[PDB]
Amino acid sequence: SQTVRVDIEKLDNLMDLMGELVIARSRILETLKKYNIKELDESLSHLSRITLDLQNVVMKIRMVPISFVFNRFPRMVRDLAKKMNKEVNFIMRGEDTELDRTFVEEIGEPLLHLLRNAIDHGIEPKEERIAKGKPPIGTLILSARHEGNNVVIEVEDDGRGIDKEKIIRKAIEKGLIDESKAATLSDQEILNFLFVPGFSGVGMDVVKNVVESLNGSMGIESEKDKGTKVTIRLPLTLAIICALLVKVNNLVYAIPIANIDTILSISKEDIQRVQDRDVIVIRGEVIPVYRLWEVLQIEHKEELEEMEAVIVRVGNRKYGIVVDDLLGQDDIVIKSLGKVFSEVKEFSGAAILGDGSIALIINVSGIV
Amino acid sequence: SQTVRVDIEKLDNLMDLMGELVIARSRILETLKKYNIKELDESLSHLSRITLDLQNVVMKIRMVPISFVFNRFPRMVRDLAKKMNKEVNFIMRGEDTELDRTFVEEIGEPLLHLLRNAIDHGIEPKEERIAKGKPPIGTLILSARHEGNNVVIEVEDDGRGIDKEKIIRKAIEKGLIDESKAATLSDQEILNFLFVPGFSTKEKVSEVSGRGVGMDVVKNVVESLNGSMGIESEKDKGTKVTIRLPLTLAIICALLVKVNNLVYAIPIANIDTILSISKEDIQRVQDRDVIVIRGEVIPVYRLWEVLQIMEAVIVRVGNRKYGIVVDDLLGQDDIVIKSLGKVFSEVKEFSGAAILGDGSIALIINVSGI
Ligand SMILES: [Hg+2]
Ligand SMILES: [Hg+2]
């Protein structure tokens, strides 16, 4: 039995292609469910059979059980526990959950930081433990599982929580928070502060950096004196999302339909500048407009008296993206270029359109 | 980001699956065209683009530069030039041309034969060259390139080439032709007498050491890879032998037949008719077994007898029209031919094998080899 040296790029093409295939299949299947010709069904079923089996084989080439990374943790946790004179009940779940070989080497250290973090500022000393009337032995859980097109990983504990007020008063000092906008902030955007470089040595920002370079996402959930639950979501296979194709200076960009609110057709008189940015008011609501070409360091090419503004949506605050044209909707395959786009504020990645072409994905959050 | 070592067992599934996808695409398109469907043209065009792109990257992976086999030739040619007391100007081109890994191991020996052949009986001794007014030093070119889903390897001469009249003369003595009559067939047609086993030397395939390999054997190897061989020569000008090798999958329609519970495939291209028959219809004349169809006495062979342990698959090879007896037919099927090399090379009965939808191996029968 032999093996062959295969370039990592080739395995990436296979991945993209498979994702493309998933979409092609699905579409041809949907555009002809009405016809009820037995000969046709049997051909469709064959296509799907081969398509599904093809995806399987690519997965086998790329997948690996998360055991690889998980296995070394109990001992490390056992030892981190000794140094900090505190006993902990460590529990791992779904160690057999499979993920991309690429992830094993990289997710290892970020996961350790979360476990260590839990053992320091999570689980409290036996003194506090008893004062709050919580069990003497603390609980630390590392979970792994599949959900949709994501390899989900969570680290849970019954520590001291986070105390959101600690973050508010601490954030009011340096930059961002004023004070009256803090009392109007969502509960997740305070736990999100935890990622800003100036807070809380390694931090917590560096962990999210890694998970993002892998095209994954990180989340925090905590309750004062109850515990903390940090979630990491990793792509299982490539991500397929519906997007709005937009044209600017003849180039095509994609805006995730998920973030889109409604599309306007604003004019020049319709714009009014207030200090640093331009804005439009819609039903008494102030929405800051941004010309995509100004954001991408590009040039003007005939200012159309009637412009089109894709009004986007961030958690609680919304904006507007003025573009040249609106090509239409499209199901697209997001490429594994995490390392590449994680450094760019303007884009969140590159996608593969049905066309067969590549379009950058406008990163709405990075344009505020 | 370097590389990753993948099991060939998985990479082989990709080869088989990609075959099925192509076939699965044509199947669906055909059935669509039958019942007349039109709205599915864009999504279908995408599928085909993807299908095509998948095939390429899947092939590309197994590929490697021909420079793997080419690089060892200069020294070998320099050495073969020494033994024959003759200097040669050897030139290689397109060493960077890629082809399937399978071919590297197999194409090596066949190409050495052509090089040696050229250096030996092709380029004349220096005295002769100055007498014919050709540059004293002989030239030999070994080149490769891509010419539309094929790797074209060429070995070219400056030598004496070969005289068509000298071969016709021998083709006369032993069977092949008339004193002149049939000889009026195109120059290319008359060069293939070099691909006949009995030509040039003696026959044992094991007997290479002490006599030679034989031009016919080179053709067989390149064909077992599903390639094609061609020759071109001009008296006292030179010789150019071309070898073509497929860059993609070869899909042919074949008749699946069963013998002793094993499945064999007979290329539909040959079969002219299929009819059910019984033991009593097989009349044994000389040593041969035959059947009578509308009064035509037709030669017949029991497949389990040709190999080693009823339906009559009448085929047509050139002039020959004979039948192949089997236990039962398992209908038609589009199959993908797989590369092996020195495997089915010596076996005349087979021209290779194909993989079936269910994952079972199906030996493809060589009609002309019976
Ligand atoms: Hg869509
Ligand atoms: Hg067929």
Curated annotation (Swiss-Prot), chain B:
It is found in: Cytoplasm. This is Chemotaxis protein CheA. It comes from the Bacteria. GO terms for molecular function: ATP binding; phosphorelay sensor kinase activity; protein domain specific binding. The gene is cheA. The chain holds residues 293 to 670 of 671 of the full protein. Residues 1-249 form the Histidine kinase domain. It comes from Thermotoga maritima (strain ATCC 43589 / DSM 3109 / JCM 10099 / NBRC 100826 / MSB8). Keywords: ATP-binding, Chemotaxis, Cytoplasm, Kinase, Nucleotide-binding, Phosphoprotein, Transferase, Two-component regulatory system. Residues 251-370 form the CheW-like domain. GO terms for biological process: chemotaxis. It catalyses: ATP + protein L-histidine = ADP + protein N-phospho-L-histidine. GO terms for cellular component: cytoplasm. The keyword Nucleotide-binding applies.
